[PDB]
Design a protein around this ligand. Structure first.
Ligand SMILES: CNCc1ccc(Oc2cccnc2)o1
Length: 330
């Protein structure tokens, strides 16, 4: 079997992408943030604190004839951005782009932090990292991919994120019409539960390529590209007026600037992020100060290849017995 679903930017800045997911019988369709940096499928629900819901579509397990309480299971998660949520767990039928999983753990939110409440376009998350990160206790649960893997024609999923445009998540097959040239595969470490790999280097604009190993994770649930301070300094030094601002929270630059591209290495191959992809607009409405799409990972403890980087490629998450990551231009 296979699945194919369209993923859509939640706003003008591609701050995140939402994908429709069918849950229960009859289907309840919720727009979920597919996150390869986490491993919980959680949703706004009929159980979520009333004052913490503001515009979101909710999952009502009591309206689903195939929902079953997973007795005594609870979950609690916190993300790299400071947000968090928690609640209880049902199993139900979950379908993504025509691909169906029965008995999927659907983690129902009792509580969500203010940033979740504040975003009416995201109805929850669907984790696609390794199941060892799943937060359900006392019985840890499997991600959707993991549950589906057996059924798939090939044990893979692919992320084809758009720049200011819809993209696609495919399950169980590689669409050879979706990328240019060939796919370069690279080794993955599963030891931290992430799709963790090692980039071979970088270039700033038309600059010479710097060969250097940069460990990082492929994280569709993170908006920006977070890299070592050396790398990031080297990038912003090419932008007149760019500065790191502690009051703002990172690098900002003149909104009048034209940004240089950023190239990252995948083995012997190169993925080029166009400069426009690195522009995240005014730090505040009307401001002439713009927020950068490449930021320091110093203080995160890990480098993150977030949407800014992934959307410049066709990315293959290969969940074979020995997982690997593939990158192609498109
Ligand atoms: C806006 N804060 C809540 C929110 C929206 C999407 C996500 O999910 C995240 C955020 C950061 C890292 N990984 C996943 O949280």
């Amino acid at each position: 079997s296979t699945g194919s679903a369209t993923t859509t930017p939640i706003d003008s800045l591609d701050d995140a992408y939402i994908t429709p997911v069918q849950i229960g019988t009859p289907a309840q369709t919720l727009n979920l943030d597919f996150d390869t940096g986490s491993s919980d499928l959680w949703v706004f629900s009929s159980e979520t604190t009333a004052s913490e819901v503001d515009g979101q579509t909710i999952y009502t397990p009591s309206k689903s004839t195939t929902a079953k309480l997973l007795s005594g299971a609870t979950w609690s998660i916190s993300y790299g951005d400071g947000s968090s949520s928690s609640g209880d767990v049902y199993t139900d039928t979950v379908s993504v782009g025509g691909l169906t999983v029965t008995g999927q753990a659907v983690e129902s939110a009792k509580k969500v932090s203010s940033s979740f409440t504040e975003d009416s376009t995201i109805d929850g998350l669907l984790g696609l990292a390794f199941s060892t990160l799943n937060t359900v206790s006392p019985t840890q649960q499997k991600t959707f991919f993991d549950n589906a893997k057996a059924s798939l024609d090939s044990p893979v999923f692919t992320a084809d994120l758009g720049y200011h445009a819809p993209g696609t998540y495919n399950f169980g097959f590689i669409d050879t019409t979706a990328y240019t040239g060939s796919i370069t595969y690279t080794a993955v470490s599963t030891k931290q539960g992430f799709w963790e790999w090692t980039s071979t280097g970088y270039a700033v604009g038309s600059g010479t390529f710097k060969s250097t190993s940069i460990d990082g994770i492929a994280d569709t649930g993170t908006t920006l590209l977070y890299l070592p301070a050396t790398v990031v300094s080297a990038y912003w030094a090419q932008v007149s007026g760019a500065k790191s601002s502690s009051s703002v929270g990172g690098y900002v630059f003149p909104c009048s600037a034209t940004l240089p591209s950023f190239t990252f290495g995948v083995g012997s191959a190169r993925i080029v992020i166009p400069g426009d992809y690195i522009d995240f607009g005014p730090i505040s409405t009307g401001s002439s100060s713009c927020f950068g799409g490449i930021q320091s990972s110093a203080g995160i403890g890990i480098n993150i290849f977030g949407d800014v980087a992934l959307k410049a490629a066709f990315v293959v998450f290969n969940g074979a017995t020995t997982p690997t990551l593939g990158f192609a231009s498109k």
